[PDB]
């Protein structure tokens, strides 16, 4: 009956922005700086959702 | 036939870049509050960032 939730605000750096990818999550799914991701834009309830998923064949 | 994609690779701590044109069109601002969904898809994960209203920080 519990869980935890990560909560995050983006990372600035024109403006530029980025997301944090957890520390203990990123070592869970061996996340490597090769990983290759498409990102699309989505939507749940009025709340905008950005889904970056995985995709090996697009690793070079 | 054709398209043009971006493809994304995590940037170190490792970050995800947020193509300007998409920050852009859903108005990124650097206080926005995202909470940190995972899923599993065709064989892979899916880290979604909802952004969310009744939350803080």
Redesign the interface.
């Known amino acids: 009956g519990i869980r935890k939730?990560?909560?995050?605000?983006?990372?600035?750096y024109?403006?530029?922005?980025?997301?944090?990818?957890?520390?203990d999550?990123?070592e869970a799914?061996d996340?490597?700086?090769?990983?290759?991701?498409?990102?699309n834009?989505?939507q749940?309830d009025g709340?905008?959702?950005?889904?970056?998923?995985?995709?090996?064949e697009?690793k070079i």
């Open positions: 939730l990560v909560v995050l605000n983006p990372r600035a024109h403006t530029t922005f980025y997301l944090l990818i957890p520390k999550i990123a799914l996340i490597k700086p090769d990983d290759t991701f498409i990102l834009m989505e749940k709340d905008i959702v950005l889904s970056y998923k995985r995709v090996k697009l």
